[PDB]
Design a protein around this ligand. Structure first.
Ligand SMILES: CC(=O)N[C@H]1[C@H](O[C@H]2[C@@H](O)[C@H](O)[C@@H](CO)O[C@@H]2O)O[C@H](CO)[C@@H](O[C@@H]2O[C@H](CO)[C@H](O)[C@H](O)[C@H]2O)[C@@H]1O
Lengths: 296, 304
C-alpha cells in the first residue's frame, strides 16, 4: 500500500538544500514549469536526475584537483569516491541544481586532513568551464595541489561574477553540458506546491528562500517502500497531528510532485500551519477536483 | 503494524552523528563496551532520545543570537527553526553535535539579510568552562558578527582541544552538556552489548578529524534514515530483539545475521576475535526476519 511519511513538515528537509522546511507556497511567476534535478523520484521510488536517498549527499561535490592556466578545477567523482558515469545522470548524485548563480563552497581534504590548511573556501562560477556532465568544473581561490581529493559543501550562493544578471533565481537549473523531466501544472486551476527553506542567498528573487517539490525524507520513504502506483493521483489530507483535523486536500502525481487548488486567486497552502502531516487517503482519477485550500 | 527496517543499501545512507555517507561497519572492544551517543538515538517503536533529529538537515547544527562579553563572544542558543530552547526536554537543542572533548571548527551564516562573504563566519567552539549548551549558551572564538545577530552554524571539522590537555580526538565520547555545574537532563541512556559474545555494530563515516583515535572515522549506532523510518512507522516492539539478515540487494544472499534491540542499536557475534562486519560489503540491505529472545544465539559474522 502507498503511504507518505507520518512526520510533521517542519521536522523535514528541503530536497535542494540541507535546510528545514519552514513554509509551503504556490508561484504563478515561477510555477508554470520546473525541472529541478534534486528531490526528484516517482511515487513507486525510482530516483531521477541527481537526486540522492540521503541528505548527506545533497549539495556536495567530490573530485581531484587539476591545475590549468585558464584556472584550477575538479575532475568529478561520486561522493563515495567511485567513478562518475555520464550515461547515468546529468552530474554526480547530489550535485547542486541551483542554476545561473555563483556557488561559494567549503572543500576539505579526504586524505590525511591536517586542519585549517586542508579546508578551502572556493568559488564555482557557471561560465564556459562549468561542464559537470563531462565531469569537470573550474574553481576560483583553490590553492590545493594537483590530484588532491576534496569533498565540497555548498556554503552560500550569490549573483553571477560576470554581472550578466544582478539577482539569484533559485527556480532555474544549471546547464550541465539524463535530465529529470519538466513538471507542468496539470490543469483546472491546480498549482504545484513548493516546500520552502531558508538558505544564505545574496539578492534572491524570493529572498533567502529555496523551493523544492518534495521533502528529502519523502524521497527515502518512496525509494524504500516501492509501493506500486495504482492510480493517476494520490489524494492526500494535510492534517493537524494533535486534533486530526483535515486542513486541506492535495494531489500527489506519480512523477513525485504535489498540487493544490488555491481559494479564488489566494496564496493556497502558504497560510496553513507548517507542523501538519500529509496522509494518503486514496488513488483518484485525473478528473478528481480538489476542494480549494487556504484563504481568498 | 509490522516492524521493518528501510530496504535501502547501507552506502546510500548517512551517519547519525555527522552528515556523511556510511562507508564501513566495525566493532570495538576498546570503545564499544559502553556508548552514550545523544544523536542517532531512537527506540524501534520510534521514540526520539537525546538531541536526535528526524532530519539530517538538523544534525551537527547550532542556532543562536551572538552575545559580546569581556570573557569573549558566544551564542544564546535557540532550536534550528528559531523557536526557544527549553532545557527540560533535551541535553541541548535538537541536532546539537555530540562529539565530546575536542575543538569544533564551524561555519556560521547570518539568517537575516545575508550580504555574502562578510555574513559567513569561520568560528571555533571549545569544550572548556564556558561550554554550557544545556544552560543555553556556548562561548565562540574568532566570531566577528555583531551582538544579537542570528546565526545558523554547521560543523566543518574537529581537532584536539585548544587547552592541550589531550593531543587526539576520541569521537566515542559525548560533551559535558551542563559544564562542571550540573549533569544534563534527558540524556539518551548508556548502551552495552547484551548477548553471548555479542559486540555493538558501529556505522562508520569519514569526516575531517585531526589526530582522531580512529583517524578520520566517526562511529554511530544507526543510519539517520533508519531514525526517520522508526519515528514514521511507530511499529509496536513485539519481542526482546529483531533478528535481521544483511543481504546482497542484487544477489539476494544472506551475508550475516544481526540482532536489533528495542533501545535502537544492533549487535553481531564476531568469528573468533575477528573484525566482525568490517569485511562485509557496504552496499548490502538489512531486512527484518522475526522477533527473537535476547538469548537467541547469532551465527558468527566475518573472518579471523
Ligand atoms: C602540525 C602543527 O603543529 N599544526 C599546528 C599549526 O602549526 C603551524 C605553525 O604554527 C607551525 O610552527 C608549523 C609546523 O609545525 O606550521 C604550521 O602551519 O598551528 C595551528 C594554528 O594554531 C594549529 O591548529 C590548532 O591546534 C590546536 C591544538 O593544539 C587545536 O586543535 C585548534 O583547534 C587548531 O586550530 C595546528 O595544530
Amino acid at each position: 500500500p502507498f503511504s507518505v511519511p507520518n512526520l510533521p513538515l517542519n521536522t523535514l528537509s528541503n530536497s535542494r538544500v540541507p535546510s528545514l522546511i519552514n513554509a509551503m507556497m504556490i508561484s504563478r511567476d515561477h510555477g508554470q514549469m520546473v525541472q529541478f534535478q534534486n528531490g526528484r523520484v516517482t511515487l513507486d521510488g525510482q530516483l531521477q536526475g541527481t537526486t540522492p536517498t540521503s541528505l548527506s549527499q545533497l549539495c556536495k561535490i567530490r573530485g581531484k584537483v587539476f591545475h590549468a592556466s585558464g584556472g584550477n578545477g575538479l575532475n568529478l567523482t561520486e561522493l563515495d569516491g567511485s567513478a562518475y558515469h555520464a550515461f547515468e545522470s546529468p552530474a554526480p548524485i547530489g550535485f547542486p541544481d541551483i542554476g545561473d548563480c555563483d556557488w561559494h563552497m567549503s572543500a576539505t581534504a579526504t586524505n590525511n586532513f591536517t586542519g585549517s590548511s586542508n579546508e578551502y573556501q572556493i568559488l564555482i562560477k557557471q561560465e564556459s568551464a562549468f561542464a559537470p556532465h563531462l565531469g569537470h568544473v573550474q574553481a576560483d581561490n583553490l590553492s590545493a595541489g594537483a590530484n588532491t581529493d576534496l569533498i565540497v559543501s555548498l556554503s552560500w550562493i550569490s549573483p553571477v561574477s560576470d554581472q550578466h544578471r544582478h539577482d539569484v533565481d533559485p527556480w532555474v537549473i544549471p546547464r550541465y553540458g539524463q535530465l529529470a523531466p519538466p513538471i507542468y501544472p496539470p490543469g483546472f486551476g491546480e498549482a504545484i506546491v513548493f516546500f520552502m527553506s531558508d538558505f544564505p542567498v545574496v539578492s534572491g528573487v524570493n529572498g533567502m528562500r529555496i523551493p523544492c517539490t518534495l521533502p528529502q525524507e519523502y524521497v527515502a520513504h518512496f525509494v524504500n517502500e516501492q509501493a506500486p502506483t495504482r492510480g493517476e493521483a494520490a489524494l492526500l489530507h494535510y492534517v493537524d497531528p494533535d486534533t486530526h483535523r483535515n486542513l486541506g486536500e492535495f494531489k500527489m502525481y506519480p512523477e513525485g510532485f504535489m498540487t493544490c487548488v488555491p481559494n479564488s486567486s489566494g496564496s493556497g497552502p502558504q497560510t496553513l500551519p507548517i507542523n501538519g502531516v500529509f496522509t494518503f487517503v486514496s488513488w483518484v482519477s485525473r478528473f478528481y477536483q480538489l476542494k480549494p485550500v487556504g484563504t481568498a
